[PDB]
Amino acid sequence: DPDQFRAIIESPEGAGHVGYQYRRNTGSTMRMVSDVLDERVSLWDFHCDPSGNVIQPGPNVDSRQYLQAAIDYVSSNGGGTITIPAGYTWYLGSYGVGGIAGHSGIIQLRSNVNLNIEGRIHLSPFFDLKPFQVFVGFDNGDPASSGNLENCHIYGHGVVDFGGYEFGASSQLRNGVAFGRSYNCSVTGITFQNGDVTWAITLGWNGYGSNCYVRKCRFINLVNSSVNADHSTVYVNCPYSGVESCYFSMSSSFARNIACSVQLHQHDTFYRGSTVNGYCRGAYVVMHAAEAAGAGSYAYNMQVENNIAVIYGQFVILGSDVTATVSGHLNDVIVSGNIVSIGERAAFSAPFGAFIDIGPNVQDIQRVLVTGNSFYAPANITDSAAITLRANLNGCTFIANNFDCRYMVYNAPGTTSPVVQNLVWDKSNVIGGTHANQRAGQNLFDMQFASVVNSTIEVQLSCEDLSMFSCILFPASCQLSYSKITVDSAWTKSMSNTAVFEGNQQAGANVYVSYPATVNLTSYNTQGAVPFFSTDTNYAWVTSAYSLSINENLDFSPPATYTNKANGQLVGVGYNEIGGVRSVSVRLMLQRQV
């Protein structure tokens, strides 16, 4: 059979007849070439016509069926890694079939089958104006009946290019990788670019999943039209999962108004070490009761740390909501080490600039620590705040940040009336001066709430801003109790108003407050120790006060310290070297229970 031998060698079984032993090692396995080649697999092993002849990829070739066949086949052997080869662009031009069809899926991923994308995957214009999810991990059109996707990793130096196609309708959805009910899945190194999509990657489904991660990926120009309803680049919807060391960039005007880089929706999730530019928002951090089926109705242990961002709206948005039968709770959050700015834009030209936003009764948000962050907004941006507190809050703690923007705490008057509890603004927060002189008519801490309880505001200025109406103001509609409100005197000598309580709330039994004020006093005419009394009777709530002014006089001195009287006068004991009625104006620190 020498003719048969040559034909076998030239046949597809040929490599299975050529023997091999590793490095001529007589202790190694006696193999055939085919066995060694079978240790790897690429798209080339499936990218063939029905007669087995390889097809070159290109804009006129739908690679979908070939990629699916490769995934299917490797799955059947218990898994492996399929290379998508460098130096080629592989186009996708049709929808997939079966369980992914309900999900507008293109490729169905399978457990233990990894994709090493080194070349480029592009969408063909078949998808213009249509929905799609490029890779889908569900195995059923009903996700509630889907099996899991496990141990599926997408990685490499390659690219997923969405073709630039706009959305056809705002009700459509588009995704890159919908991992599904995903356990130990990841995407690493991939660039996702040029699209109009809802998400690039979604991890999990309604809390179902674990240990899913997006690392060292790039996301570039993924919103490009006015049709696109909403965008969150990575959507984390399973626990013990997160995003780290990624890069996010947008250039579209639309992105400034609708795009968020990350949403965290389940417990023990994180967003670290990433850089964002051109987005509306940094991260949504939420527990929606609608997605509580997999991991519970609490989102807790949520970390947003060490990120760099230029955004046009709000850095971190906190929220929760409820269903008719399920209640969401958000607690145990840390936001730390982030360096964030509002990009150059006109005032009011994008959603309100904020480092933290509490968005819209329902909210159950508490135990949030905001520490060691920097925030800046250019001086023209009136709509910029350390916190826009627009809905109920049950706790948030700010320590050792540096906030350089128009407001510290803001809510718009006559909009929402939030109930606030456990808002803590430590004195170690540094208030920048970029907006000094821009604050005519404005309150630095504008406390436009229904009520404030168990809260601390310790205002410390670091430069003058005499333009502002006040440092902190409480409208008469805001109840205030069991709270501590202080204004440090530095840089406040020339301010007409420091703290303003429009309903005289500072008189509350459990309100602890100190702020500077100018007070007119008159003494009796007695030589020697002599009392000085305030002309006004607005000080019934004052427990003590003390001088912030020098005494220009030789012949007498006002009291250093004052207490009050039943009629609301302040009273203190000064000294008349020579007698006579004295009249002075003095800057005092007014104190109540502090």
Site for its own copies in 198-257 (CB under 8 A): 211, 213, 216, 218, 240, 244-245, 247, 249
Site for its own copies in 271-290 (CB under 8 A): 272-273, 275, 277
Residue nearest to Na ion (CB): 450
Q: Which of residues 438-457 bind Na ion (CB under 5 A)?
A: 450
**Which H helix or E strand runs over 378?**
none
462 touches its own copies (CB under 8 A):
yes
Calpha distance 318→315 (Å, rounded) = 10
> DSSP letters of 190-255?
-EEES---S-SEEE-BTTBEES-EEES-EEE-----SS---EEEEEE-SSSEEEES-EEE---HHH
Place of tokens 């006068």: 569
Could you tell me the smallest distance in angstroms from the CB atom of residue 451 to Na ion? 5
Cβ 119 to its own copies, closest distance in Å?
8
3-class DSSP state for residue 46? coil
CB 438 within 8 A of CB 408: no
CB of 321 to Na ion, least distance (A): 23
Distance from C-alpha of 513 to C-alpha of 483, rounded to nearest angstrom: 8
Q: What are phi and psi of 467, to 5 degrees?
A: -75, -30
Contact positions with its own copies (CB under 8 A) in 312-341: 332-334, 336-337, 339, 341
| Interface mask toward its own copies for 392-431; x: CB under 8 A | -----x-xxxx-x-----------------x-x-xxx-x-
Question: Which does residue 160 touch among Na ion, its own copies, none (CB within 5 to 8 A, set by kind)?
Answer: none
Binding string, 557-586, against its own copies, x = CB under 8 A?
xxxxxxxxxxx---xxxxx-----------
Tell me the C-alpha to C-alpha distance, in Å, between residue 221 and each of 192, 248, 320: 9, 9, 29
Specify the residue, 129 or 548, whose C-beta has the smaller distance to its own copies: 548
Select from Na ion, its own copies, none the partner in contact with residue 463, using the beta carbon and a kind-dependent cut-off of 5 to 8 Å.
Answer: its own copies
**CB nearer to Na ion: pick between 72 and 502:** 502
Rounded CA separation 178/140 (Å) = 13
| Helix, strand, or coil (residue 395) | coil
Rounded Cα gap, residues 348 and 357, in angstroms: 16
By CB under 8 A, what part of segment 119-148 binds its own copies? none
493 binds, among Na ion, its own copies, none (CB under 5 to 8 A by kind): its own copies
Going 511 to 513 to 517 to 519, the CA torsion angle's sign is: positive
Return d(Cα 590, Cα 353) in angstroms, integer. Answer: 34
**29 lies in the site for its own copies, by CB under 8 A:** yes
469 binds, among its own copies, Na ion, none (CB under 5 to 8 A by kind): none
Among 451, 454, 477, 537, which residue sits at the site for its own copies (rule: CB under 8 A)?
Answer: 454
CA atoms of 394 and 384, how far apart (whole Å)? 23
Residues between 153 and 182 with contacts to its own copies, criterion CB under 8 A: 153, 157
Residues within window 56-95 making contact with its own copies, judged by CB under 8 A: 69, 73, 77-81, 83, 85-88
Kindly calculate the radius of gyration of the chain based on its CA atoms and give it in whole angstroms.
33
Alpha carbons 237 and 316: distance in angstroms, whole number: 17
Among its own copies, Na ion, none, partner that 450 touches (CB below 5 to 8 angstroms by kind): Na ion
Among 126, 347, 543, 580, binds its own copies (CB under 8 A): 543
How far is Cα 360 from Cα 357, in angstroms, rounded to an integer?
10
Instruction: In angstroms, give the least distance from the CB of 84 to its own copies.
Output: 11
For 9, residues 6+ apart whose C-beta sits below 8 A from its C-beta are: 17, 18
Nearest distance in Å: CB 560, its own copies: 4
Rounded to the nearest whole angstrom, what is the least distance from the CB of residue 396 to its own copies in the complex? 10
Q: Which residue, 42 or 225, is less far from its own copies as judged by CB? A: 42
Q: Are 93 and 67 in contact (CB under 8 A)?
A: no
| Single residue of 141, 164, 372, 475 touching its own copies by CB under 8 A | 372
Strand partners, 515: 590
Whether residue 395 contacts residue 361, with contact meaning beta carbons closer than 8 Å, is answered with: no
* Closer Cβ to its own copies, 143 or 433, answer by number: 433
Nearer to its own copies, 260 or 511 (CB): 511
Residues numbered 479 to 498 that lie near Na ion (CB under 5 A) are: 479
Compute how many other C-beta atoms are within 10 angstroms of the C-beta atom of residue 421. 18
Binding-site annotation, residues for Ca(2+): 102
Nearer to its own copies, 146 or 544 (CB): 544
Strand pairing report for 281-288 and 231-236: unpaired
Q: Which stretch binds Na ion (CB under 5 A): 35-43, 209-217, 268-276, 473-481?
A: 473-481
Rounded least distance, CB 132 to its own copies, Å = 25
Nearest one of 150, 138, 142 to 177, comparing CA atoms: 138
570 Ramachandran zone, left/alpha/beta (phi>0; psi -120 to 50): beta
Considering the complex, what minimum distance in angstroms separates the CB of residue 324 from its own copies? 27
By CB under 5 A, is residue 476 in contact with Na ion?
Answer: no
| Interface residue with its own copies, options 415, 522, 535, 551 (CB under 8 A) | 551
The alpha carbon dihedral of 186, 132, 124, 58 has a sign of positive
Q: Binding residues for Na ion, per CB under 5 A? A: 450, 479
